[PDB]
């Protein structure tokens, strides 16, 4: 229930964003923890309900189980499969207000910081276009570290 | 748990705003239901923990019990009394991120629409300064109706 004392509620925003620098697994599933601004990102060869559940499994290992997750109305998020996986985990789910305007501005911003940092780290290593496959995992983890941890 | 299907989470934002047109009970306690934008406002002679609980009792009769309520760090919201009253009701409570910037922008906007509508309805009835005490309850309920219900 409580958000840990008066602290922010454990609510996540999750989305998928396409990043060809990461092909063939160019579908990046990104979660932003709304209380701490922490971000979890994983790569996927296809945008599907199952890819979203593999991504939430990893985000759950990294940040803990949330009380609720916010997403858009994508089929990979409203499928019977995905609802059931979130029901199995005890996580509430919302797609927001029908005509929400857009409510998930934090995940959108996360999407943009990530593509920019990926581009900057990749160009730093000489990769001006698609990152060679064997170099992608450590570069993506490097971009996730860069936006999460500030030695400060 | 679930927000009713994929609908918005039952989360409220509550605050107090001072309105001398309503003296002596010039302290308006306002709650905005974040999923529907509905607003509940009650008047109070003083800003205290108890006034906030009387206001939530009324908001609960009008909108139902919420899963969580967001407020600032006012003493009337972090007192042992208020925490206990919310714990008695099973409602989670958050004051947000310490240095949240300000997270409760919806209640702030609600505060402004309300003072403006109160001023407009009062000037419409010839009351250019404090509203006579005996006319306040129906004018405040009138401003709450005006911002909640659109015959559309």
Short mmCIF file of C-alpha atoms in Angstrom, two decimals, chain A residues 54-152:
data_model
loop_
_atom_site.label_atom_id
_atom_site.label_comp_id
_atom_site.label_asym_id
_atom_site.label_seq_id
_atom_site.Cartn_x
_atom_site.Cartn_y
_atom_site.Cartn_z
CA UNK A 54 10.60 -10.67 -20.68
CA UNK A 55 11.43 -6.93 -20.26
CA UNK A 56 9.26 -6.61 -17.10
CA UNK A 57 10.91 -9.76 -15.66
CA UNK A 58 14.31 -8.05 -15.98
CA UNK A 59 12.98 -4.65 -14.67
CA UNK A 60 11.50 -6.57 -11.70
CA UNK A 61 14.93 -8.14 -10.98
CA UNK A 62 16.53 -4.72 -11.09
CA UNK A 63 14.01 -2.46 -9.35
CA UNK A 64 11.69 -4.74 -7.36
CA UNK A 65 8.04 -5.49 -8.02
CA UNK A 66 6.03 -2.27 -8.66
CA UNK A 67 2.49 -1.66 -7.51
CA UNK A 68 1.38 -0.49 -10.93
CA UNK A 69 2.65 -0.10 -14.46
CA UNK A 70 1.49 2.51 -16.95
CA UNK A 71 1.60 1.84 -20.69
CA UNK A 72 -0.10 2.91 -23.90
CA UNK A 73 -2.81 0.86 -25.61
CA UNK A 74 -0.43 -1.18 -27.77
CA UNK A 75 -1.59 -4.72 -28.48
CA UNK A 76 1.53 -6.01 -26.81
CA UNK A 77 0.25 -4.37 -23.60
CA UNK A 78 -3.49 -5.06 -23.77
CA UNK A 79 -3.34 -8.64 -24.98
CA UNK A 80 -4.94 -11.35 -22.84
CA UNK A 81 -1.47 -12.80 -22.38
CA UNK A 82 0.08 -9.58 -20.94
CA UNK A 83 -2.89 -8.90 -18.65
CA UNK A 84 -2.56 -12.40 -17.32
CA UNK A 85 1.18 -12.10 -16.77
CA UNK A 86 0.66 -8.86 -14.76
CA UNK A 87 -2.21 -10.49 -12.87
CA UNK A 88 0.17 -13.44 -12.02
CA UNK A 89 2.59 -10.90 -10.57
CA UNK A 90 0.03 -8.89 -8.58
CA UNK A 91 0.84 -5.72 -10.55
CA UNK A 92 -1.97 -3.28 -11.36
CA UNK A 93 -2.06 -2.00 -14.89
CA UNK A 94 -3.38 1.17 -16.54
CA UNK A 95 -3.40 2.50 -20.07
CA UNK A 96 -4.63 5.81 -18.58
CA UNK A 97 -7.44 8.15 -19.70
CA UNK A 98 -9.03 7.26 -23.07
CA UNK A 99 -7.76 10.32 -24.82
CA UNK A 100 -5.17 10.76 -22.07
CA UNK A 101 -3.55 13.40 -24.26
CA UNK A 102 -0.50 11.36 -23.51
CA UNK A 103 0.16 10.75 -19.79
CA UNK A 104 3.48 8.88 -20.03
CA UNK A 105 5.73 11.85 -20.63
CA UNK A 106 8.42 10.42 -18.34
CA UNK A 107 8.94 7.27 -20.45
CA UNK A 108 8.92 9.41 -23.58
CA UNK A 109 11.70 11.56 -22.20
CA UNK A 110 13.56 8.35 -21.19
CA UNK A 111 13.19 7.12 -24.80
CA UNK A 112 14.88 10.30 -26.06
CA UNK A 113 17.76 10.41 -23.53
CA UNK A 114 18.48 6.79 -24.29
CA UNK A 115 18.59 7.11 -28.10
CA UNK A 116 20.79 10.12 -27.77
CA UNK A 117 23.23 8.50 -25.31
CA UNK A 118 23.33 5.34 -27.52
CA UNK A 119 24.21 7.51 -30.54
CA UNK A 120 26.88 9.44 -28.60
CA UNK A 121 28.50 6.30 -27.15
CA UNK A 122 28.35 4.53 -30.51
CA UNK A 123 29.89 7.47 -32.42
CA UNK A 124 32.52 7.63 -29.65
CA UNK A 125 33.59 4.05 -30.57
CA UNK A 126 33.61 4.79 -34.32
CA UNK A 127 30.22 3.30 -35.13
CA UNK A 128 28.42 5.93 -37.12
CA UNK A 129 25.58 3.72 -38.29
CA UNK A 130 24.43 0.24 -36.99
CA UNK A 131 26.49 -0.94 -34.01
CA UNK A 132 28.17 -4.33 -34.79
CA UNK A 133 26.03 -7.03 -33.11
CA UNK A 134 28.77 -8.29 -30.80
CA UNK A 135 29.25 -4.78 -29.32
CA UNK A 136 25.61 -3.98 -28.67
CA UNK A 137 24.96 -5.53 -25.24
CA UNK A 138 27.78 -3.70 -23.47
CA UNK A 139 27.00 -0.45 -25.29
CA UNK A 140 23.25 -0.62 -24.30
CA UNK A 141 24.23 -1.49 -20.65
CA UNK A 142 26.69 1.43 -20.89
CA UNK A 143 23.92 3.83 -21.92
CA UNK A 144 21.68 2.48 -19.08
CA UNK A 145 24.50 3.08 -16.54
CA UNK A 146 25.14 6.60 -17.95
CA UNK A 147 21.56 7.70 -17.38
CA UNK A 148 21.10 5.92 -14.02
CA UNK A 149 24.19 6.45 -11.95
CA UNK A 150 25.75 9.76 -11.14
CA UNK A 151 28.86 9.50 -8.96
CA UNK A 152 27.29 12.38 -7.00
#
